[PDB]
């Protein structure tokens, strides 16, 4: 839900995400885990009344049974990263590339390469940006009163790269 990223005033004409609203956008990703499998996602992000909805379909293939993913060898935390955005004027949307480094319990790291593509659902005009990035900072926690498998996420996202 990158439509909640803080775009500085001098960079507001580069906010594709918010300009596609209320009709929204389709977000597609290929997440490739190094020496393991891949996730292929298709999501629809749009407004349903005053509520922002993110409907996703995830498909994961070629994963190792006792790899870092299916064997649950990753620590419960998240590192800071940058999402590098570029325009896709041919598809009236954007493309994004970034690397996520998950911490493994032995002290090593599991690389997850992300390729992203976003296209508007509506016919209305959108903002096609110049090259920039989104500085992300996340923190994961647990609700002590919850017994179901869960995750509490606190995230801060700010756009940068253009002065």
């Amino acid at each position: 839900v990158q439509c909640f990223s803080r775009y500085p005033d001098h960079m507001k004409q580069h906010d594709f995400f918010k300009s596609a609203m209320p009709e929204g956008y389709v977000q597609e990703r290929t997440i490739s885990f190094k020496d393991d499998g891949n996730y292929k996602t298709r999501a629809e992000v749009k407004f349903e009344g005053d509520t922002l909805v993110n409907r996703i379909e995830l498909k994961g293939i070629d994963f190792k049974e006792d790899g870092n993913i299916l064997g649950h060898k990753l620590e419960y935390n998240y590192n800071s990263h940058n999402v590098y955005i570029t325009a896709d004027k041919q598809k009236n949307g954007i493309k994004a590339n970034f690397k996520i480094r998950h911490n493994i319990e032995d002290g090593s790291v599991q690389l997850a390469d992300h390729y992203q593509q976003n296209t508007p659902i509506g016919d209305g005009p959108v903002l096609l940006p110049d090259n920039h990035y989104l500085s992300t900072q996340s923190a994961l926690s647990k609700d002590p009163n919850e017994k179901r498998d869960h995750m509490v996420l606190l995230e801060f996202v700010t756009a940068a790269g253009i002065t």
Binding site: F4, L52, L58, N77
Partner: protein, 63 residues
Amino acid sequence: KGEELFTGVVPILVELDGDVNGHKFSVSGEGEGDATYGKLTLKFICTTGKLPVPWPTLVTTFX
């Protein structure tokens, strides 16, 4: 319209249907976002039982 719909606190809903190596699962997420501060506060619950993949692997898909 557009940016004007994000000037304040907006409620968020996340619904995911997954299939990883045959292991089918569903996650429901609720929370809010304040774009003025680029802040996201969300809680995700696996509605099909236990998640067959670690939670950190899904953060970018969620969000």
